[PDB]
Design a protein around this ligand. Structure first.
Ligand SMILES: O=C(NO)c1cc(-c2nn[nH]n2)ccn1
Ligand code: NI
Ligand SMILES: [Zn+2]
Length: 330
């Protein structure tokens, strides 16, 4: 078995290897990459996502979110308080202000220490799930706006016909901006490109051990768990590496820098934080290997996880027994 210890693997495709997205995903899996739940892809040096990021300040963040924590430093939930709209230009200036700027630090280890020590005592702002793309239309390889859709994969594998069209989204982050422990909707893959700015640190649990994380989360957030078995789909819960180690949860960590892709694999739980102002782009995608994860994916039916109407047909086709209950929660 390839990659038995479930280490996060890093790939350096050549230009020729970068010309067929699904073929290269399959190659990474032939090397065991998916056993970690996350992989890093460094594009060939000749490739470029966009020629220049001039005028990115003109993008609108219609509903910036302030991430307010409750709990202890290593075990906390966050809720989002909505803020007034601001442009990326205004957001970047706020990120670099004295209140929000990255602190002096010796190296990544030091910064990660300061994050887990101090995150709960600040409430950073960020811009999430903004439909859009920053790839140049003439970037032809690994352009997240020109991938095959999840609907076309499902139609091809199952011979069904469904509505829906999935598109990429943008994220704007600052120091301490946080993504909570989750897997993707329907346990799909995701791909994330860091366009611009400071790094993003990721934590991941191997798919073969995701239920261990679920059981710990239920123990650590009892009230949250009671309302909904699938409450990690609410994207609210954080658990530090120190607490994971203390409870024997297997995980790994890696830092993504600008110009690098990260892929998450089906049922790979992930979480992380931003080092400073940055801009990323992400989309979900599917392969033939995903179909059996989609059929088994847990669902939130309590109401809290709102998800846009692409997901209806996925529940309807793959999980018809669960559909009426899921639909009631919507
Ligand atoms: O919401 C997510 N996946 O469904 C998600 C969000 C992030 C994130 N990156 N920068 N800010 N947020 C990363 C991984 N996953
Ligand atoms: Ni994610
Ligand atoms: Zn729920």
């Amino acid at each position: 078995a390839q990659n038995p210890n479930c280490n996060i693997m890093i790939f350096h495709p050549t230009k020729e290897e970068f010309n067929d997205f699904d073929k290269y995903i399959a190659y990474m899996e032939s090397q065991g990459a998916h056993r970690a739940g996350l992989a890093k892809i460094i594009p060939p040096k000749e490739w470029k996502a966009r020629e220049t990021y001039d005028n990115i300040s003109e993008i609108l963040i219609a509903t910036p979110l302030q991430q307010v924590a409750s709990g202890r430093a290593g075990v906390f939930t966050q809720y989002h308080k909505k803020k007034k709209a601001m442009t990326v230009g205004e957001y970047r200036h706020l990120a670099n202000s004295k209140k929000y700027q990255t602190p002096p630090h010796q190296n990544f280890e030091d910064l990660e220490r300061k994050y887990w020590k101090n995150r709960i005592y600040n409430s950073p702002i960020y811009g999430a799930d903004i439909s859009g793309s920053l790839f140049d239309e003439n970037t032809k390889q690994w352009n997240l706006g020109h991938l095959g859709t999840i609907q076309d994969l499902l139609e091809k594998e199952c011979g069904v016909v469904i509505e829906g069209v999935n598109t990429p989204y943008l994220y704007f982050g600052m120091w301490k901006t946080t993504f909570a422990w989750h897997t993707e909707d329907m346990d799909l893959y995701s791909i994330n490109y860091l366009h611009l700015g400071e790094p993003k640190t990721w934590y991941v649990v191997p798919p073969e051990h995701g239920q261990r994380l679920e059981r710990l989360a239920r123990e650590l957030f009892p009230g949250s768990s009671r309302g909904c078995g699938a409450f990690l789909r609410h994207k609210v819960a954080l658990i530090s590496p120190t607490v994971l180690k203390e409870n024997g949860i297997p995980f790994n960590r890696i830092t993504q820098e600008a110009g690098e892709f990260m892929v998450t694999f089906p049922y790979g739980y992930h979480a992380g934080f931003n080092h400073g102002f940055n801009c990323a782009e992400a989309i979900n995608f599917a392969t033939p290997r995903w179909i059996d994860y989609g059929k088994m994916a847990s669902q939130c039916s309590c109401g809290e996880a709102r998800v846009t109407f692409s997901m209806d047909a996925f529940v309807r086709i793959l999980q018809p027994e669960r559909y009426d209950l899921w639909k009631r929660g919507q």
